[PDB]
Amino acid sequence: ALLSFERKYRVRGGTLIGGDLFDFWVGPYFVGFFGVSAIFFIFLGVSLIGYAASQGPTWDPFAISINPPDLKYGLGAAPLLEGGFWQAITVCALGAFISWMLREVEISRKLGIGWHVPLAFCVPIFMFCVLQVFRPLLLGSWGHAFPYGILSHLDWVNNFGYQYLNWHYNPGHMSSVSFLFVNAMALGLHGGLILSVANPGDGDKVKTAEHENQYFRDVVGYSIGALSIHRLGLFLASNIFLTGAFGTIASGPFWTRGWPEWWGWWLDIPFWS
Amino acid sequence: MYHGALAQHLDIAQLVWYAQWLVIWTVVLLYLRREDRREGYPLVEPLGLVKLAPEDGQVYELPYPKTFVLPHGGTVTVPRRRPETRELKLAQTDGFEGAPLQPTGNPLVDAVGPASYAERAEVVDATVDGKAKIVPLRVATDFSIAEGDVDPRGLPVVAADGVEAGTVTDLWVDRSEHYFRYLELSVAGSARTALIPLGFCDVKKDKIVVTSILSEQFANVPRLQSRDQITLREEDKVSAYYAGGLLYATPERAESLL
Amino acid sequence: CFEPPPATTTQTGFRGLSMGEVLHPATVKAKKERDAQYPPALAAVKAEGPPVSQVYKNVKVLGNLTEAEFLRTMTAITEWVSPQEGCTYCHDENNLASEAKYPYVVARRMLEMTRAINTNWTQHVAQTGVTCYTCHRGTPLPPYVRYLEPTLPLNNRETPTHVERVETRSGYVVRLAKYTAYSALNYDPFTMFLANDKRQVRVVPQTALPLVGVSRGKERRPLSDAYATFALMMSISDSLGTNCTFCHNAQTFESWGKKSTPQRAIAWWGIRMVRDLNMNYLAPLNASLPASRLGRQGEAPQADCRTCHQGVTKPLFGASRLKDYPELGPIK
Amino acid sequence: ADYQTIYTQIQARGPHITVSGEWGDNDRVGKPFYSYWLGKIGDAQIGPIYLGASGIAAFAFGSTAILIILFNMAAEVHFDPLQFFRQFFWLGLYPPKAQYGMGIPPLHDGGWWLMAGLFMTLSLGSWWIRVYSRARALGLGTHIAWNFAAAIFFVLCIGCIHPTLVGSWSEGVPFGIWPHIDWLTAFSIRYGNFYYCPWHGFSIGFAYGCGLLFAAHGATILAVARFGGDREIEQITDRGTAVERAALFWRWTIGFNATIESVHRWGWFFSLMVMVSASVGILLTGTFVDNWYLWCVKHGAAPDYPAYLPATPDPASLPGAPK
């Protein structure tokens, strides 16, 4: 059950709700009140998915799709088969994600560590809300949100992009993509570096912090240091969505033309027109 | 005819799909997840008594040992025999397998839960060229505080209960990374020194705020063996002490926030 | 920078596919007011007396009409094409049968063209049809026309800047961009696809695997064709004030059936119609026009999707005068 | 809150450490300077920089490439410097528009493009040698160089390996801000929607996973900064409470965990797999798959949806319809 070093940390306390009532483990998993709400919402969501899927055409996991309502239903409840299942499932997902986050808070308090992880996990919960809640509120229908299917959701991303002619030219997207790419690079650099220090191989000896910083100074004239690459990492990753959100929320409510056209602000200044 | 077609509804890209997944799970399961087991394994149960032969799964889940040749002599081999020797001052709140343990004594001194420390080497972490890495400024005289920032030497340390608990005498610097890691302080009314990691310090212009522990609790901060250096284990001991505070400093911090 | 909410949306595909129109009310209202300027139909006249083929001297196209009917046609033509210039734009004051002015001969061909559109291209213009107004919008030179090279502004009623002027070479990339909805796509889709029928718009294979014989080296179409098609599609999208999902489910641009809308079929006929119009009616008018009308390679101005649509998915929001002016087609 | 995780409250200055490499210690140039604002969120020391043969070779070849691009860009605005600044994003250097196959294209139609390609490629190889050799010189693993080799391999795939395999330089990526972007849609359109390329999906999976892992890892280390978790090398060789707590955070959350070393392996591998997966996709594209959507349909993967507006027969296949 327990890691060699685990028993000493496995103490009572650090909950947010319920004190001792849900303060226990099952196997390796901490439970908490928010473990219980999580499982509740997962069960409900997965049930609702299974029921909805059986009423549909196929059972191929690639081709299953639970879609939101038509636009004509605006912000109302829709009949279950024609968007209600999607509405219910959306609520269960948010229940599950927020539970998962708050559970991580409780686990952080018990260990006496920072809340940075649940904090970082708010970012993707927020971005999910941008797509499924906030942007559909501003446009006025739930039918603007994305369908739950492995491949069907890609068809939505696809068409949504082409509603604005060339989505690549969306400035929030440009920012988002740049953070996605630079974040992946940096993870490779970081992971590479650490392993390069602890694993020179050929029985050669493990190196030092000094070696870490010397390597990057030599190659690119600067080394951000050990703690800071972790701060930068969290920052770069989180900005994939924090900036992308603006580009997503802008498209429709604050901009109805194609995204390349938006660059008129620059191209069409009279001074050089 | 078709580029990439093979006999009877097979094509190249379809085989590569299967290959790609095989490669992934191979690396994930047989390589990565075994690397994940280099610490804390083998697992412990309510007494795994089978003392003459090993259970099969426990051998399969581990990788072949690796040996790090440490930079200043020595080797470490992982995974290894590493049981927790020291008596933990904790009691089982129930019979259930995954019930929490309660501290029996004073959990900051007893060093349990969030106040726990790893059994690291009683060895001074070193610079690239052999010197002690984490040393106070009285020793590291070629290091200064940067032009612009608070010099905390002189300023009072106010604990969580708003009570001045000591005066900051020195900063301990990391000579390998050029980074301050602890403040040294005199515990008022105790004629002793005490380290606090900068992470538990709110550095202001006129004071240093520390919300982790009470003023009285600065009494029992782990003592160092020496005045002007610190061991890897001592760093764990000291850091752990304050972190314990977060849950244990008052009774109400263990309880539900709501 | 930005356009304030709310946005009018429509649905053009199955719920969940984010297919449909995204429109800014202010912009639609402006285009609606502009298009509302379409003059109302002239009052009907009772048909009396002989055909004007027995009355007037030089009537080739409208000879079936009676005198009152015919002069109604001429009054409407003036209102639609030369309202500020008047009857004398096409005629000698003292000889209404003289062909001495170039607008007279062009106007004859335009009558033939307009009747052709309403008879042979009903697959595109349907019951709505077109009149002279559709393109001309009350000026002899239609606002939206194309030369064999891109020009700015798109509306020839606006005065060009130095860079916009076609002879200024440093502005080529911008002239081109504004025809392709601001993309850097480096292709003029008008000369490539709408001026004539030499090029195939479709670029996407209709087989999963590459066919041996068409798939290696010089057998292959260059990727430039796919860029060109995209450019045509950006241009088309912009010219109707719409987006790709009006006509396509982007899941498979190449597919028809449930993956396309009826508007896509109509757009297909539009390409064909635009080609007929350019090749057989508009392009040959370089012989009949002054050099001040011609472009820099002696080409007459020709039509694209914008010429009629002017940023609306139906020209003039579907306004029609077809019943009001039978003489402009369809012709049995 | 631990404010040290947000920024350095008290910066330290001290003498500049130089770790001696097995060669090139004299080729380090510049004198170090310190930035106070940088040192709030980083290490304050900027410079010096190593300046070897491979690095100089790289600058040489890269500058040639950049010059070939910029000259062609300027030619596209008939050398007007004001329109160059205005239109910069729209300017580019294109591969051949006409099908010459593998023929060396004329300079006016993608010969310059081809040349810029060579010189960039040489620049990447030279820099690769720098990244590798510096690791050997300081007695370090070549882990970074192998991740970077994958990145370079992917660039060669889109730029010349794929064009070689189908046999047309016309399918290269143009140089230019918007023009390299325009290629993405043209390529996707040509090959039947890249969302239906499984290697695209894998690449995205790993790319998003790099997001997940670095957010999670970064946040984990900051959350154990108090116990020294940033000093990761010595937490490998001598497990401290930092990495004990870090591991138990995850074990109690998701049911399993890593070591402080292995999480770096996870991350390195995920990073690597973005480029490896992308590369496999491009190698299969054109070569052995022409339309990824139809390929997914062929194998019963594609989702289908009811008509909303009426289904619309292709008018080109009605009887008596025009060309």
Ligand code: BCB
């Ligand atoms: C043709 C259409 C285009 C398009 C349309 C598009 C749209 C419409 C949008 C994006 C967006 C984005 N695009 Mg994108 N795009 C991108 C990259 C990106 C992303 C960086 C960004 C964010 C995606 C996102 O929001 O995830 C969302 C991820 C979420 C919400 C994660 C939720 C996690 C959740 C909390 C937890 C879930 C838990 C599980 C259910 C639990 C189960 C686990 C199991 C193990 C138990 C690249 C790199 C490219 C390239 C190379 O060309 C590209 C091309 C295009 N995009 C095309 C041009 N793109 C988004 C953006 O930011 O725009 C600016 C966006 O809205």
Ligand code: BCB
């Ligand atoms: C605007 C941008 C969108 C976008 C655009 C996008 C693109 C372009 C592509 C994907 C792909 C994927 N997306 Mg996705 N997406 C997904 C999940 C997925 C996976 C099916 C797949 C790989 C993800 C991955 O490895 O991430 C990183 C996480 C890792 C590695 C941890 C493991 C994640 C695990 C594989 C998740 C599996 C989820 C389950 C299948 C669903 C839950 C089942 C229930 C019953 C328990 C979820 C759960 C959400 C939510 C809840 O918001 C989401 C939102 C979006 N995606 C936005 C709508 N997505 C790729 C794909 O291949 O899809 C077919 C792909 O190419």
Ligand code: BCB
């Ligand atoms: C409409 C068109 C689409 C498209 C078209 C597309 C294409 C054509 C290709 C991809 C590819 C990829 N797409 Mg993608 N895409 C992606 C994500 C991704 C990437 C993960 C993946 C790999 C590319 C990469 O990381 O390069 C970033 C890293 C690079 C480019 C390596 C650079 C390293 C190099 C050594 C740096 C050197 C620079 C020098 C310093 C400077 C020198 C230059 C000077 C001298 C001029 C998302 C998340 C989405 C969403 C959400 O919609 C999306 C939608 C689309 N893509 C649409 C479907 N996508 C690639 C792929 O995986 O295909 C299977 C790919 O080839």
Ligand SMILES: C/C=C1/c2cc3[nH]c4c(c3C)C(=O)[C@H](C(=O)OC)c4c3nc(cc4[nH]c(cc(n2)[C@@H]1C)c(C(C)=O)c4C)[C@@H](C)[C@@H]3CCC(=O)OC/C=C(/C)CCC[C@H](C)CCC[C@H](C)CCCC(C)C
């Ligand atoms: C998933 C895997 C990811 C990944 C991985 C990796 N990527 C690496 C490594 C790994 C492992 C390296 O070790 C190496 C490196 O060195 O890192 C520090 C490197 C590289 N990744 C760069 C750019 C990049 N990666 C991209 C993408 C991905 N990468 C994908 C996502 C993209 C995108 C997204 O388009 C871009 C633009 C360059 C910074 C660099 C090559 C420089 C060159 O080839 O010379 C080219 C020669 C030149 C003259 C160009 C000069 C200008 C550039 C900006 C360089 C200036 C540096 C200079 C030293 C500054 C001096 C200032 C100083 C005095 C203060």
Ligand SMILES: C/C=C1/c2cc3[nH]c4c(c3C)C(=O)[C@H](C(=O)OC)c4c3nc(cc4[nH]c(cc(n2)[C@@H]1C)c(C(C)=O)c4C)[C@@H](C)[C@@H]3CCC(=O)OC/C=C(\C)CCC[C@H](C)CCC[C@H](C)CCCC(C)C
């Ligand atoms: C920049 C920010 C980045 C970021 C950051 C972080 N990410 C974190 C953390 C941080 C910090 C954690 O602390 C946490 C975790 O524990 O780490 C292991 C986590 C996690 N990241 C996951 C998925 C993930 N991260 C993504 C993206 C980013 N992450 C971006 C890049 C993406 C995509 C798509 O890119 C995916 C798929 C899970 C594995 C895990 C949540 C588990 C959960 O929530 O359990 C509880 C919920 C369940 C077990 C299932 C719920 C079932 C519902 C009710 C029914 C299904 C509904 C559903 C909407 C249907 C969709 C169908 C689909 C085909 C369309």
Ligand SMILES: CC(C)=CCC/C(C)=C/CC/C(C)=C/CC/C(C)=C/CC/C(C)=C/CC/C(C)=C/CC/C(C)=C/CC1=C(C)C(=O)c2ccccc2C1=O
């Ligand atoms: C049945 C029942 C009633 C149970 C009650 C209890 C309860 C609530 C149980 C929950 C059950 C559920 C829902 C389980 C599902 C668990 C989930 C969500 C698993 C998802 C796992 C996935 C796919 C993760 C993706 C990320 C990934 C590839 C991680 C691999 C590497 C790992 C494990 C990283 C985590 C990790 C990081 C990020 C470090 O930085 C770090 C630093 C130092 C030491 C260790 C670590 C470490 O482990």
Ligand code: HEC
């Ligand atoms: C060009 C856009 C024209 C304007 C404006 C007007 N007319 Fe016209 N007219 C035009 C053409 C091409 C023709 C020949 C038509 C044909 O069927 O071939 C005509 C003809 C006439 C006639 C018949 C006279 C004759 O040819 O013997 C008359 C009497 C006439 N037009 C009168 C007329 C008036 C009164 C106008 C202003 C209200 C007017 N026309 C405008 C071309 C154009």
Ligand code: HEC
């Ligand atoms: C778009 C399909 C058009 C319709 C319908 C009509 N016209 Fe037209 N016309 C069109 C173009 C592209 C051009 C070339 C530009 C030019 O100005 O020559 C024209 C030209 C004319 C002219 C000549 C005017 C001039 O050059 O000064 C005339 C007199 C004219 N058109 C008349 C006309 C009439 C009477 C129409 C309805 C019967 C008509 N046009 C329809 C485009 C289109």
Ligand code: HEC
């Ligand atoms: C209707 C008014 C359309 C809009 C808006 C868009 N497209 Fe289109 N497209 C349309 C037609 C009628 C055709 C067929 C042309 C023919 O002559 O046969 C097309 C074709 C394409 C293709 C090529 C598909 C193939 O079979 O090879 C592509 C790739 C394409 N269209 C893409 C596309 C995009 C991205 C659009 C938004 C910018 C777009 N189209 C708009 C009709 C209409």
Ligand code: HEC
């Ligand atoms: C004048 C001769 C036209 C030109 C040139 C083009 N179009 Fe057109 N279009 C025209 C009319 C009179 C109508 C009828 C409006 C109606 O009520 O049916 C149309 C219609 C369309 C449509 C249908 C729009 C809808 O159903 O909402 C589409 C999609 C369309 N046209 C597209 C299109 C394209 C792509 C063109 C260039 C190839 C084009 N049209 C040219 C008149 C004229």
Ligand SMILES: CC(C)=CCC/C(C)=C/C=C/C(C)=C/C=C/C(C)=C/C=C\C=C(C)\C=C\C=C(/C)CC/C=C(/C)CCCC(C)C
């Ligand atoms: C046998 C011989 C003859 C043929 C083989 C030669 C060969 C191997 C050719 C290979 C060519 C290859 C791999 C081409 C790949 C091209 C690609 C992927 C281009 C991609 C992007 C290009 C971009 C973004 C170009 C931008 C250009 C500019 C911004 C102008 C140049 C100036 C700069 C300052 C560059 C900054 C770039 C960025 C960091 C902001």
Ligand SMILES: CCCCCCCCCCCC[N+](C)(C)[O-]
């Ligand atoms: C992101 C795109 C993912 C598409 C996944 C489709 C893979 C098709 C291969 C299925 C395996 C072969 N078979 C026989 C079941 O058809």
Ligand SMILES: CCCCCCCCCCCC[N+](C)(C)[O-]
């Ligand atoms: C689409 C990209 C696929 C990425 C695959 C990474 C999945 C990680 C799986 C964790 C498995 C955990 N465990 C304990 C069962 O081994």
Ligand SMILES: CCCCCCCCCCCC[N+](C)(C)[O-]
């Ligand atoms: C076949 C596709 C699977 C995609 C990857 C799914 C990730 C697996 C994580 C679930 C395992 C959870 N567990 C047992 C470790 O707790």
Ligand SMILES: [Fe+2]
């Ligand atoms: Fe790390």
